[PDB]
Structure formats: C-alpha cells, structure tokens
Design a protein around this ligand. Sequence first.
Ligand SMILES: Cc1cc2nc3c(=O)[nH]c(=O)nc-3n(C[C@H](O)[C@H](O)[C@H](O)COP(=O)(O)O)c2cc1C
Length: 379
Amino acid sequence: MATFPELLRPLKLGRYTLRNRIIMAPLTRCQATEDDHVPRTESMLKYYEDRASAGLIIAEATMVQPNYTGFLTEPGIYSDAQIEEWRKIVDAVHKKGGLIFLQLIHAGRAGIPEKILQQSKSDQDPLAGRLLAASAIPIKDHRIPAYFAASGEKETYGVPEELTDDEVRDGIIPLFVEGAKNAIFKAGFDGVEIHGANGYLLDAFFRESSNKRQSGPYAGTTIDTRCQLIYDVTKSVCDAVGSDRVGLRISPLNGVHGMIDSNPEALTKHLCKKIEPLSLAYLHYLRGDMVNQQIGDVVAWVRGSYSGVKISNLRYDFEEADQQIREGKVDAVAFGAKFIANPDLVERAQQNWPLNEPRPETYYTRTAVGYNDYPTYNK
Ligand SMILES: Cc1cc2nc3c(=O)[nH]c(=O)nc-3n(C[C@H](O)[C@H](O)[C@H](O)COP(=O)(O)O)c2cc1C
C-alpha cells in the first residue's frame, strides 16, 4: 500500500469511518424489474457484495416516485417489495464489512414519456401519469438513449408540466423523505445520497437553462431560489434520518441534456455556503463535463466554500485522487467506470496492480454480460 497511501487513508464520514477513500460512484445498471422496479436480487446482490471492499458504495439512482422512470428498469425504494430485496442486498454488503448509501432520484423532464404517460391519472394519485419538471422546457437536440427507451430505440423526450410550488412542497419533497426513511429504517442502508445532478429534477431547478420559473421560492430568476429545492429536499431528509446519514450530489458543469448555467462558480459557491449549516455526511460533485464542453475548477470552488467532506468525481485515476487528497483539495474520490470493470478495485490500488479495461458498450445489457463478468485480478 505504498503507491497510493493518501487514497488508502481512513475517513470520517457522517457517523461512519471509511476503511479507505476509494468510493464507488452511483451507477445505473438497469437490473430491476421493468413493471414493479424491484431489484433483481440474484444479480444485484452479487454485483454489490463483490465490490464491498470500497470505502463506501453509493448505490445507483433509485426512484422515489412510483413509476416515475427515467431508465426504464431502474430500482425504486417506495414499495415493500423493493424494500425487501434492497434489504438483502444491503445485508450482503454489510456481511463483507462495507458501507452503502442509496442515491435517491426523480428524473424530472428526463422521464420516459411512453411509460409515464401510460400510467393512470387519478385524483387520489395526483402526480401519477404526468411528466413533471421546474419549467415546461423539453430536452432539446438530445433523444432518449436506446438503453433507456421503452421501445429499445432512441425516443423523444416530452414537454413536462411545470410543477406548482404546492406540488413541490407537499408532493415531491415528501417522496424523497419517505424514500430516505424506507432506505435507512427499513432496508438498512447506512445513508442516502440526494441526486441533485446530471439534469434530473433537482439539478433542473438548480441551473438556469432548465429553470425559468417566474415566481415562488423556487424561481429560476436568482441563484438563491434556484438552490432552494436542493436545500429543502436535503434539509427535510436530514430532519427524518439525521444529517450524518445524508449526502448530496451535484454537477455544476455537466452538460448532459443540454444543462447549463451562465455562472457555475457563483452558483456552486452559493450552494456550498447554503448547505454548510446542515453538517451533511458529505458533498459529492462531478468536477467537470461528461460531454467535454464546459470547463471550471469545481474542486477549488468547493474547497474554498465548503468545510465538510468533499467527494470529487470524473476521470480520476489512483495517482490523481491520491495527490488531490494529499494536497487537501478533496477528502475522497468516487470512481464510476473503474468500479464497473474492477470488483476488486481497492485491492488493485493496494498492490498497484493493473486494471481491467471497461467495455463501455455493455453497461446496460440487463443480463450477466458486462455486469457480473468482470474478473478479479488473475482470476
Ligand atoms: C453506466 C453508467 C451509469 C451511471 N449511473 C449514474 C447514476 O445512477 N447516478 C449518478 O449520479 N451518476 C451516474 N453515473 C455517472 C457516474 O456516477 C460518474 O459520475 C461518471 O461515470 C464519471 O466518473 P468516472 O470517470 O469515474 O467513470 C453513471 C455512469 C455510467 C457510465
């Protein structure tokens, strides 16, 4: 463990202490049932337990609103059936001595029209059968990926309804809260991660391009009001399960779905100071753009405006993560692609062993291929 000593240091995170700072980023793999969104335990339990040596595992984006799917077959955490399977998966990770937080998501305008708009639309279930977002602005010049599309081929995103302030406060927020309770109190997760990134609902209220709301506490007119939904959701979840079991993820420069803010630096620093009072377990962020267009020193922005645990992500390797931790710029680094391809990523870091190359074209097969078929070193 001489090559990356800083990366292998333990870390106090919330009410826990990580064995190392090699974190497994949340990765949607679509291994849940399509209709009920129940985790397919047979494959998911193995997948997660095989990666349980990670300092912390952040489980893939999981639905908080019934049937509001964005990835067609992702997991949910709203039903008893989902809770039970997650419970078994979590227990498996815990038997290996690992830690695991569940990422909570609401796809917002990235919801799949052909599925959501097919659901029933009753008065007792006011949010059902509807596309919901901050503003009625559809994702443009970007179609639904074949691996997420209901038909299996690229489909068009739809124009979402503009959530009223009451629907946000009494409809959306409570779902995140209940999802957190289900995850922690019933399934046994060590914590939850609020998905405030990658163009989904919370991020959609966060950045200018998707939030043009004219009035209300979530107006798109000012940085503070755009930060409010992320804060309110996070705060209410903290009220329910304890801030030391709550993390938050953001991506100020991620251009997926055409997301963009004209002043990412000011926005990020403003959010950091706004959540500073919550004493969260951690703040998780993408330091760059998945589409390689937007640039900005997110690591520096966060380092100078947030005193809590900072988890950075995006195109990191052991050496760089180790160095940034050494310099105190970040506390830990979350790896996505490398964890998909290396169940024993941590062990490889300890021995400075080479890594399996990822097969980026097999990330969403929904079968064992490209999911549970990556070998550990020399096996
Ligand atoms: C197949 C796949 C699924 C992903 N699923 C999620 C997700 O559910 N939630 C999320 O916040 N990010 C998700 N991401 C983004 C990753 O968490 C991570 O930020 C990204 O892979 C960049 O990090 P890397 O360079 O270490 O791979 C996903 C990425 C991939 C490639």
